Structures are given as C-alpha cells and as structure tokens.
C-alpha cells in the first residue's frame, strides 16, 4: 500500500500533433465476465483490486 | 486532384528530404535540425540517452 519514498525520472514516449481540445478525464478497467456475474452489463460488473 | 488545406491546423504530410555528406576535422557550417554553427566535428566518447 501507498507510494514508496523514492525518486525516479520519467522518459518521454510519444508526441502527438493532434491538437484537439481536452477537458475531461476518465479511466477504463478490466471486467470479469463469467458464471458469477452473468447477463448484461447491469449485473456483470465487479471492481477487483 | 491533390487537394491541400490552408487553415489553423498543424501540417501532417511533410518531409523535407535533402541530403549532404559529413566531413570531419574541418571548420564547416552545419544545419543538423535547425541549429546552426561553425566548427570542427570529431568523434566523441560521451554516451547519450536514447
């Protein structure tokens, strides 16, 4: 748990010339669909650690 | 018909090409990537990050 006490620099990966207007932010996750939570997206949804 | 576009958007299709050889140990003008200067170019042992 919790971010450890340390230092680490961050190296660039990509640069995008898209130039669109950005205002909002949301994150995706992985959903476990099986016999435990069958059906549509109403009931087939779990959080997970 | 190849249609361009003139607007306030950055250019996507580009590429200047151009090519000249490299010389060493001679004072010469260079324009690598926009930067310009005069001097001699020698092999260096310093290591850059990728």
- C-alpha span between A9 and B48 (Å, rounded): 16
- Which residues of chain B make contact with A17, given a CB cutoff of 8 A? 10, 12
Resolution rounded to one decimal, in angstroms: 3.2
Q: Residue B50's beta-bridge partner residues?
A: none
Is B39 in a helix, a strand, or coil? strand
Tell whether B12 is within 8 A of chain A (Cβ).
Answer: yes
- C-alpha span between A5 and B4 (Å, rounded): 53
Q: How far is B30 from chain A (nearest CA, A)?
A: 26
- C-alpha span between B44 and A23 (Å, rounded): 46
Match 């001699």 to its residue by tokens.
Answer: B40
Q: How far is B50 from chain A (nearest CA, A)?
A: 10
Widest Cα–Cα separation across chain A: 46
- C-alpha span between B41 and B23 (Å, rounded): 8
CB neighbour list of residue A35: distance below 8 Å, 6 or more residues apart:
none
Method: cryo-EM
- Which residues of chain B make contact with A19, given a CB cutoff of 8 A? 9-10
């Amino acid at each position: 748990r919790d971010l450890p006490q340390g230092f680490s620099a961050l190296e660039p990966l990509v640069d995008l010339p898209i130039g669109i207007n950005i205002t909002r932010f949301q994150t995706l996750l992985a959903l476990h669909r099986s016999y435990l939570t069958p059906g549509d997206s109403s009931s087939g949804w779990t959080a997970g650690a | 018909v190849l249609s361009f576009e003139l607007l306030h958007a950055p250019a996507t299709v580009c590429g200047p090409k151009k090519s000249t050889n490299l010389v060493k140990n001679k004072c010469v003008n260079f324009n690598f990537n926009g930067l310009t200067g005069t001097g001699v170019l020698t092999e260096s042992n310093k290591k850059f990050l990728p």
